[PDB]
């Protein structure tokens, strides 16, 4: 009825990685700018055209997609899929993003922008947290009003590749002009590979 796969798996070039799907299981590769493609069907069958570095297996309720001699080009979303005959329905796993670690760790630089004078004239305020020059391309963003977590008015982009091949991300906190003046300070907290980088901004004082 439900297929469970981890949201994130990583490995270095030339190494072997596995992606587990726990519930016949079919595997699809999703590369950007292309249709989903079948890599493995019926647990173990590799269709003609699929490189031999991909293989599938199943023991009990646990299906596994393996990639040997991992390539940077294998970076993609991988989806497991079943036919639930009791409900006569197709069931998908949540997807696994495969990261291929092709350069060393680089910590993000975080820059927090206050709302502009122009936005405040329009009776609005947005805080912009710019996150740049990080690898790998995964961060968690948490916003703070003084010390307390902000649970609403937050929009965050999925990391995008910069022209230098490191990653960037952006986060936005929407608030009222009074809220910007009510609190002493607001904070953007960024978590990357266990490490936290925090920046704070306050209304300009002259």
């Amino acid at each position: 009825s439900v297929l469970t796969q981890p949201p994130s798996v990583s490995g270095a070039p030339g190494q072997r990685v596995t992606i587990s799907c726990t519930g016949d299981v079919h595997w699809y590769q999703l590369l950007p700018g292309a249709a989903p493609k079948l890599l493995i069907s019926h647990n173990t069958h590799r269709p003609s055209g699929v490189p031999d570095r991909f293989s599938g297996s199943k023991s009990g309720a646990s299906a596994s997609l393996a990639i040997t001699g991992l390539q940077a080009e294998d970076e993609a979303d991988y989806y497991c899929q079943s036919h639930d005959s009791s409900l006569s329905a197709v069931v998908f796993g949540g997807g696994t993003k495969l990261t291929v670690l092709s350069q060393p760790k680089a910590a993000p630089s975080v820059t927090l922008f206050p709302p502009s004078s122009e936005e405040l004239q329009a009776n609005k305020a947005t805080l912009v947290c710019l996150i740049s020059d990080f690898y790998p391309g995964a961060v968690t963003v948490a916003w703070k009003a003084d010390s307390s977590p902000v649970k609403a008015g937050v929009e965050t982009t999925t990391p995008s590749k910069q022209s230098n091949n490191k990653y960037a991300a952006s986060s936005y906190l929407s608030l009222t002009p009074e809220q910007w003046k009510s609190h002493r300070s607001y904070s953007c907290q960024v978590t990357h590979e266990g490490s936290t980088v925090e920046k704070t901004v306050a209304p300009t004082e002259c």
Partner: protein, 224 residues
Amino acid sequence: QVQLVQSGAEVKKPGASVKVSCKASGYTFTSYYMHWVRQAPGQGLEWMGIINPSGGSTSYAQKFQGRVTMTRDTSTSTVYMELSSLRSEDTAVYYCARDDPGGGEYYFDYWGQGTLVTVSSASTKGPSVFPLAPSSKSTSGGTAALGCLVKDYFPEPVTVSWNSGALTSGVHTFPAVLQSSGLYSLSSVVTVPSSSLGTQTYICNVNHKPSNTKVDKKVEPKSC
């Protein structure tokens, strides 16, 4: 060749309906089942249902029961998917996907290119272009980050350049977010030398063609 061509991107108000087409060529149309599968921007693949083009019988997924209608036209080799009473959670790329009837096991061999359906209360609206005043990126490295917030626009897309295309080094323009208001917002940032602030002028050129909005916004350094 086997080819599946889907209809163009669509913009819809909540409560409305959408009809997406899937034109099949290069095989005997009635001999293969057609599925529909969606993917929301922040989610995985989601099965919607199946149609057998020979006879037109359908089986839909539980969550779309009473909301989705699948039809086919044999003479044009086209499969249709209609989704009614649309909500913001229906914002997704919709795929048609072919399935070989041999075996009984549902799995997909050939897909359409996908159709983006955006469900939003918003009508056409130009962005406000707010400056993101230069702030220290690295004081040792002597870099500053500055940008423009391209806020509250509909629909996609928007174009951003810097200094009319003269500045490309250290420019990063982010993908848009679709906010809870149903309006898009994006940012464009530039990493510049700190020493260029106050001598070199920085202007973001914002173009939103659907709303005839062209804005050239100078990003001035912070000063009391």
